[PDB]
């Protein structure tokens, strides 16, 4: 539109203020994590320079296909992390709404009607930490 990659550099600057975990809140993502997942996905689902999402609809399908194909091949921290970045980046970027945590981003994304696998309990846990000296 008006510039080169302003909308992009912006969506990233904001996403950088996003947390990875939910029961910790400390470590945040970065342009490297986002570009990593996106780029990798663009290849497996494109294999070319001019093969990136331009509309919320286009990106929406890319994600569903990314997690779909990847899932069939198997699960992995790299895969799960990839999908997470796509979500947080989509909301914190397209919606310019820098969520609080990775889960929160993917939550509103699916709850909004962008995903195809709505869940109530993704990750959590109670009573954690080392043992006590009694």
Coordinates of N, CA and C in Angstrom, one line a residue:
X1 N 0.8 -1.2 0.0 CA 0.0 0.0 0.0 C 0.8 1.3 0.0
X2 N 0.9 1.9 1.2 CA 1.7 3.1 1.3 C 3.0 2.9 2.0
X3 N 4.0 2.4 1.3 CA 5.3 2.2 1.9 C 6.0 0.9 1.4
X4 N 6.4 0.0 2.3 CA 7.1 -1.2 1.8 C 6.6 -2.4 2.7
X5 N 7.0 -2.3 4.0 CA 6.6 -3.4 4.9 C 6.3 -2.8 6.3
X6 N 5.7 -1.6 6.3 CA 5.3 -1.0 7.6 C 4.4 -1.8 8.4
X7 N 3.3 -2.3 7.8 CA 2.3 -3.1 8.5 C 3.0 -4.3 9.1
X8 N 4.0 -4.9 8.4 CA 4.7 -6.1 8.8 C 5.5 -5.7 10.1
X9 N 6.5 -4.8 9.9 CA 7.4 -4.5 11.0 C 6.6 -4.1 12.2
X10 N 5.4 -3.5 12.0 CA 4.6 -3.1 13.1 C 4.0 -4.3 13.8
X11 N 3.3 -5.2 13.1 CA 2.7 -6.4 13.6 C 3.7 -7.2 14.5
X12 N 5.0 -7.1 14.1 CA 6.1 -7.8 14.8 C 6.5 -7.1 16.1
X13 N 6.7 -5.7 16.0 CA 7.0 -4.9 17.1 C 6.1 -5.1 18.3
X14 N 4.8 -5.4 17.9 CA 3.8 -5.6 19.0 C 3.8 -7.0 19.5
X15 N 3.8 -8.0 18.5 CA 3.9 -9.4 18.9 C 5.0 -9.7 19.8
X16 N 6.1 -8.9 19.7 CA 7.3 -9.1 20.5 C 6.9 -8.9 22.0
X17 N 5.8 -8.3 22.3 CA 5.3 -8.1 23.7 C 4.4 -9.2 24.1
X18 N 4.5 -10.4 23.5 CA 3.7 -11.6 23.8 C 4.5 -12.6 24.5
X19 N 3.8 -13.2 25.5 CA 4.4 -14.3 26.3 C 4.2 -15.7 25.7
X20 N 5.1 -16.6 26.0 CA 5.0 -17.9 25.4 C 4.2 -18.8 26.4
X21 N 4.5 -18.8 27.6 CA 3.8 -19.6 28.6 C 2.7 -18.9 29.2
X22 N 1.9 -19.6 30.1 CA 0.8 -19.0 30.8 C 0.9 -19.0 32.3
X23 N 1.6 -20.0 32.8 CA 1.9 -20.2 34.2 C 3.2 -19.6 34.6
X24 N 3.8 -18.7 33.8 CA 5.1 -18.2 34.1 C 5.2 -16.7 33.8
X25 N 4.8 -16.3 32.6 CA 4.8 -14.9 32.1 C 6.2 -14.3 32.4
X26 N 7.1 -14.4 31.4 CA 8.4 -13.9 31.5 C 9.1 -13.9 30.2
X27 N 9.2 -15.0 29.5 CA 9.9 -15.1 28.2 C 8.9 -14.8 27.1
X28 N 9.2 -13.8 26.3 CA 8.4 -13.4 25.1 C 9.0 -13.9 23.8
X29 N 8.1 -13.9 22.8 CA 8.6 -14.3 21.4 C 9.4 -13.2 20.8
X30 N 9.7 -13.4 19.5 CA 10.5 -12.4 18.7 C 10.3 -12.6 17.2
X31 N 10.8 -11.6 16.5 CA 10.6 -11.6 15.0 C 11.3 -12.9 14.5
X32 N 12.2 -13.4 15.2 CA 12.9 -14.7 14.7 C 12.0 -15.9 14.8
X33 N 11.2 -15.9 15.9 CA 10.3 -17.1 16.0 C 9.1 -17.0 15.1
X34 N 8.6 -15.8 14.9 CA 7.5 -15.6 13.9 C 7.9 -15.9 12.5
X35 N 9.0 -15.2 12.1 CA 9.5 -15.3 10.7 C 9.9 -16.8 10.5
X36 N 10.4 -17.4 11.5 CA 10.8 -18.8 11.4 C 9.7 -19.7 11.0
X37 N 8.6 -19.7 11.8 CA 7.4 -20.5 11.5 C 6.8 -20.1 10.2
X38 N 6.5 -18.9 10.0 CA 5.9 -18.4 8.8 C 6.7 -18.8 7.5
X39 N 8.0 -18.5 7.5 CA 8.9 -18.8 6.4 C 8.8 -20.3 6.1
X40 N 9.1 -21.1 7.2 CA 9.1 -22.6 7.0 C 7.8 -23.0 6.4
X41 N 6.6 -22.5 6.9 CA 5.3 -22.9 6.4 C 5.2 -22.5 5.0
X42 N 5.6 -21.3 4.6 CA 5.5 -20.8 3.3 C 6.2 -21.7 2.3
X43 N 7.3 -22.3 2.7 CA 8.0 -23.3 1.9 C 7.2 -24.6 1.7
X44 N 6.9 -25.3 2.8 CA 6.2 -26.5 2.7 C 4.8 -26.3 2.0
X45 N 4.3 -25.1 2.2 CA 3.0 -24.8 1.6 C 3.2 -23.7 0.5
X46 N 4.2 -23.8 -0.3 CA 4.4 -22.8 -1.3 C 5.7 -23.0 -2.1
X47 N 6.8 -23.1 -1.4 CA 8.1 -23.3 -2.1 C 8.4 -22.2 -3.1
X48 N 8.3 -21.0 -2.7 CA 8.5 -19.8 -3.6 C 8.4 -18.5 -2.8
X49 N 9.0 -17.5 -3.4 CA 9.0 -16.1 -2.8 C 7.7 -15.5 -2.8
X50 N 7.0 -15.5 -4.0 CA 5.7 -14.9 -4.1 C 4.6 -15.9 -3.7
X51 N 4.6 -16.4 -2.5 CA 3.6 -17.3 -2.1 C 3.3 -17.1 -0.6
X52 N 2.9 -15.9 -0.2 CA 2.6 -15.5 1.1 C 1.2 -15.0 1.2
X53 N 0.6 -15.1 2.4 CA -0.8 -14.7 2.7 C -0.9 -13.1 2.7
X54 N -1.9 -12.6 2.0 CA -2.2 -11.2 1.9 C -3.5 -10.8 2.6
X55 N -4.4 -11.8 2.7 CA -5.7 -11.5 3.4 C -5.9 -12.5 4.5
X56 N -6.7 -12.0 5.5 CA -7.0 -12.8 6.7 C -7.5 -14.2 6.3
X57 N -8.2 -14.3 5.2 CA -8.8 -15.5 4.7 C -7.6 -16.4 4.2
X58 N -6.7 -15.9 3.4 CA -5.6 -16.7 2.8 C -4.8 -17.3 3.9
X59 N -4.4 -16.4 4.9 CA -3.6 -16.9 6.0 C -4.3 -17.9 6.9
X60 N -5.7 -17.7 7.0 CA -6.5 -18.6 7.8 C -6.4 -20.1 7.2
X61 N -6.5 -20.2 5.9 CA -6.4 -21.5 5.3 C -5.0 -22.1 5.4
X62 N -4.0 -21.2 5.3 CA -2.6 -21.7 5.4 C -2.3 -22.3 6.8
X63 N -2.8 -21.7 7.8 CA -2.7 -22.2 9.2 C -3.3 -23.6 9.3
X64 N -4.6 -23.7 9.0 CA -5.4 -24.9 9.0 C -4.6 -26.0 8.3
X65 N -4.1 -25.7 7.1 CA -3.4 -26.7 6.3 C -2.0 -27.0 7.0
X66 N -1.4 -26.0 7.5 CA -0.1 -26.2 8.2 C -0.2 -27.2 9.3
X67 N -1.2 -27.0 10.2 CA -1.4 -27.8 11.4 C -2.0 -29.2 11.0
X68 N -2.7 -29.1 9.8 CA -3.3 -30.4 9.3 C -2.3 -31.3 8.8
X69 N -1.6 -30.9 7.8 CA -0.5 -31.8 7.2 C 0.5 -32.2 8.2
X70 N 1.0 -31.2 9.0 CA 2.0 -31.4 10.0 C 1.6 -32.5 11.0
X71 N 0.3 -32.3 11.4 CA -0.3 -33.3 12.3 C -0.2 -34.7 11.8
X72 N -0.6 -34.9 10.6 CA -0.6 -36.2 10.0 C 0.8 -36.8 10.0
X73 N 1.8 -36.0 9.8 CA 3.2 -36.4 9.8 C 3.7 -36.7 11.2
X74 N 3.0 -36.0 12.2 CA 3.4 -36.2 13.5 C 3.5 -34.8 14.3
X75 N 3.6 -34.9 15.6 CA 3.6 -33.7 16.5 C 5.1 -33.5 16.9
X76 N 5.3 -32.2 17.3 CA 6.7 -31.8 17.8 C 6.6 -30.4 18.2
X77 N 7.5 -30.1 19.2 CA 7.6 -28.7 19.7 C 7.8 -27.7 18.6
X78 N 8.5 -28.1 17.6 CA 8.7 -27.2 16.5 C 7.4 -26.9 15.7
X79 N 6.6 -28.0 15.5 CA 5.3 -27.9 14.8 C 4.3 -27.0 15.7
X80 N 4.1 -27.5 16.9 CA 3.1 -26.8 17.8 C 3.5 -25.3 17.9
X81 N 4.8 -25.1 18.1 CA 5.3 -23.7 18.2 C 5.0 -22.9 17.0
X82 N 5.1 -23.5 15.8 CA 4.9 -22.9 14.5 C 3.4 -22.3 14.4
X83 N 2.5 -23.2 14.7 CA 1.1 -22.8 14.7 C 0.8 -21.7 15.7
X84 N 1.4 -21.8 16.8 CA 1.2 -20.8 17.9 C 1.6 -19.4 17.4
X85 N 2.7 -19.3 16.8 CA 3.3 -18.1 16.2 C 2.3 -17.5 15.2
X86 N 1.8 -18.3 14.3 CA 0.9 -17.9 13.3 C -0.3 -17.3 13.8
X87 N -0.8 -17.8 14.9 CA -2.0 -17.3 15.6 C -1.7 -16.0 16.3
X88 N -0.8 -16.0 17.2 CA -0.4 -14.8 17.9 C 0.0 -13.6 17.0
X89 N 0.7 -14.0 15.9 CA 1.1 -13.0 14.9 C -0.1 -12.5 14.1
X90 N -1.1 -13.4 13.9 CA -2.3 -13.0 13.1 C -3.1 -12.0 13.9
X91 N -3.3 -12.3 15.2 CA -4.1 -11.4 16.0 C -3.3 -10.2 16.4
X92 N -2.2 -10.4 17.0 CA -1.3 -9.3 17.4 C -0.8 -8.5 16.3
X93 N -1.0 -9.1 15.1 CA -0.5 -8.4 13.9 C -1.7 -7.8 13.1
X94 N -2.5 -8.7 12.4 CA -3.7 -8.2 11.7 C -4.6 -7.4 12.5
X95 N -4.9 -7.9 13.8 CA -5.8 -7.3 14.7 C -5.0 -6.3 15.6
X96 N -3.7 -6.3 15.4 CA -2.9 -5.3 16.2 C -3.2 -5.4 17.7
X97 N -3.6 -6.6 18.1 CA -4.0 -6.8 19.5 C -3.0 -7.8 20.2
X98 N -1.9 -7.2 20.6 CA -0.8 -8.0 21.3 C -1.4 -8.8 22.5
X99 N -1.7 -10.0 22.4 CA -2.3 -10.8 23.4 C -1.3 -10.9 24.6
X100 N -1.7 -11.6 25.7 CA -0.8 -11.7 26.9 C 0.0 -12.9 26.8
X101 N -0.6 -14.1 26.3 CA 0.2 -15.3 26.2 C -0.1 -16.0 24.9
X102 N 0.7 -17.0 24.5 CA 0.5 -17.7 23.3 C -0.9 -18.4 23.3
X103 N -1.3 -18.9 24.4 CA -2.6 -19.6 24.5 C -3.7 -18.6 24.3
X104 N -3.6 -17.4 24.9 CA -4.6 -16.4 24.8 C -4.9 -16.0 23.4
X105 N -3.8 -15.9 22.6 CA -3.9 -15.6 21.2 C -4.7 -16.6 20.4
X106 N -4.2 -17.9 20.5 CA -4.8 -19.0 19.8 C -6.3 -19.2 20.3
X107 N -6.5 -18.8 21.6 CA -7.8 -18.9 22.2 C -8.9 -18.0 21.4
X108 N -8.6 -16.7 21.4 CA -9.5 -15.8 20.8 C -9.6 -16.0 19.3
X109 N -8.5 -16.5 18.7 CA -8.4 -16.8 17.3 C -9.5 -17.9 16.9
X110 N -9.5 -19.0 17.7 CA -10.4 -20.1 17.5 C -11.8 -19.7 18.0
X111 N -11.9 -19.1 19.1 CA -13.1 -18.7 19.7 C -13.9 -17.7 18.8
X112 N -13.1 -17.0 18.0 CA -13.7 -16.0 17.1 C -14.3 -16.7 15.9
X113 N -13.8 -17.8 15.6 CA -14.3 -18.6 14.4 C -13.3 -18.6 13.3
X114 N -12.0 -18.5 13.6 CA -11.0 -18.5 12.6 C -10.3 -19.9 12.5
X115 N -10.4 -20.7 13.7 CA -9.8 -22.0 13.7 C -10.9 -23.1 13.5
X116 N -10.5 -24.3 13.5 CA -11.5 -25.4 13.3 C -11.3 -26.5 14.4
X117 N -10.8 -26.1 15.6 CA -10.6 -27.0 16.7 C -10.7 -26.3 18.0
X118 N -11.9 -25.8 18.4 CA -12.1 -25.1 19.7 C -11.9 -26.0 20.9
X119 N -11.2 -25.5 21.8 CA -10.9 -26.3 23.1 C -11.1 -25.4 24.3
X120 N -11.3 -26.0 25.4 CA -11.5 -25.3 26.7 C -10.3 -25.5 27.6
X121 N -9.6 -26.6 27.5 CA -8.4 -26.8 28.3 C -7.2 -27.3 27.5
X122 N -6.3 -26.4 27.2 CA -5.2 -26.7 26.4 C -4.0 -27.1 27.2
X123 N -3.5 -26.3 28.1 CA -2.4 -26.6 29.0 C -2.6 -25.9 30.3
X124 N -2.2 -26.6 31.4 CA -2.3 -26.1 32.7 C -1.6 -26.9 33.8
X125 N -2.1 -27.0 35.0 CA -1.5 -27.8 36.0 C -1.6 -27.1 37.4
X126 N -1.7 -27.9 38.4 CA -1.8 -27.3 39.8 C -0.8 -28.0 40.7
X127 N -0.5 -27.3 41.8 CA 0.5 -27.9 42.8 C 1.8 -28.3 42.1
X128 N 2.7 -27.4 41.8 CA 3.9 -27.6 41.2 C 5.1 -27.2 42.0
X129 N 6.3 -27.5 41.6 CA 7.5 -27.1 42.3 C 8.2 -28.3 43.0
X130 N 9.4 -28.1 43.6 CA 10.1 -29.1 44.3 C 9.5 -29.6 45.6
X131 N 10.0 -30.7 46.1 CA 9.5 -31.3 47.3 C 9.8 -30.4 48.6
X132 N 9.2 -30.8 49.7 CA 9.4 -30.0 50.9 C 10.1 -30.9 52.0
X133 N 10.9 -30.2 52.8 CA 11.7 -30.9 53.8 C 10.9 -31.1 55.1
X134 N 10.4 -32.3 55.3 CA 9.6 -32.5 56.5 C 10.2 -33.6 57.4

